[PDB]
From a paper:
Attachment of the cytoplasmic domain of CD4, however, which is the smallest unit tested, turned out to be suitable for in vitro characterization and amenable for structure-function based binding improvements. In this study we engineered a 10.0 kDa protein (86 amino acids) that binds to HIV-1 Nef in the low nano-molar range. Indeed, we show here that the binding affinity of a designed protein inhibitor to HIV-1 Nef is increased from 250 to 26 nM by fusion of two structural elements and further lead optimization. This fusion protein is the tightest binder to Nef known to date and supposedly covers a large surface on the target protein. Thus, a protein construct was designed that simultaneously covered three interaction sites of Nef, wrapping its functional surface sites to render the protein non-functional. Unfortunately, there was no electron density visible that would unambiguously account for the CD4 part of the inhibitory molecule. However, the resolution achieved was sufficient to show that the N-terminal chain of Nef in one complex of the asymmetric unit was bended away such that the binding site distal to the PxxP motif on face the F94–W117 gatekeeper residues could become accessible for other interactions. However, NMR spectroscopic analysis strongly support the displacement of the before mentioned newly identified N-terminal helix by the CD4 segment. Mutagenesis analyses showed that the CD4 dileucine motif is required for binding to Nef, while a C-terminal cysteine-rich motif, which was shown to form an intermolecular zinc-finger with the unique domain of Hck, did not contribute to the interaction.
The Nef protein is an accessory gene product of HIV and SIV that is dispensable for virus spread in experimental ex vivo cell culture systems. Thus, Nef is an important factor for AIDS pathogenesis. To achieve this multitude of activities, Nef has evolved as versatile adaptor for protein interactions that lacks intrinsic enzymatic activity, which allows the viral protein to affect a wide range of host cell protein sorting and signal transduction processes. We thus chose a strategy aimed at wrapping the surface of Nef by the combination of different, physically linked, target domains and the iterative optimization of domain composition and linker segments.
Residue numbers in the entry:
A (entry chain B): 80 to 138
B (entry chain A): 74 to 154, 183 to 207
Amino acid sequence: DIIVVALYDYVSWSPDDLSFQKGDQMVVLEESGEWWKARSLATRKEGYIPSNYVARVDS
Amino acid sequence: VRPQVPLRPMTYKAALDISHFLKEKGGLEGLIWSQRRQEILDLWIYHTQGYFPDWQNYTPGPGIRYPLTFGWCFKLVPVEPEVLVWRFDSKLAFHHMARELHPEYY
């Protein structure tokens, strides 16, 4: 799996986008655009996230 | 203390979803319109969520200004003291006035 760490807080206003908290670990599911679909290893909730707020980790 | 989220093309559901988010958050329904006040709204979204700010357009008047982007569910209503007020209408979720009165579409 490709993992990312949240370099900032993001708040979604839409149930399609995945609000996350800085330091959260997410699994990317789709890297299609500048916005990526991911899943929260914490919450198991999915959504789209702004890719410039995350940092890829080779962990 | 946060970057500018990548830009992304707006869409019925985006409009719809934003429409909901503000309706709920309150402080818009029955607010007096302005060129500026709209720009503040409209900027904060581009900044926050990546939707450029060229979607919140409305039909010319005089009378109720109906929104052009299907899914935005806020119309600009004139009241008595012509001054305009942001106003929510669920019917707008499904009824696309602007396209009725008149094709700036296709």
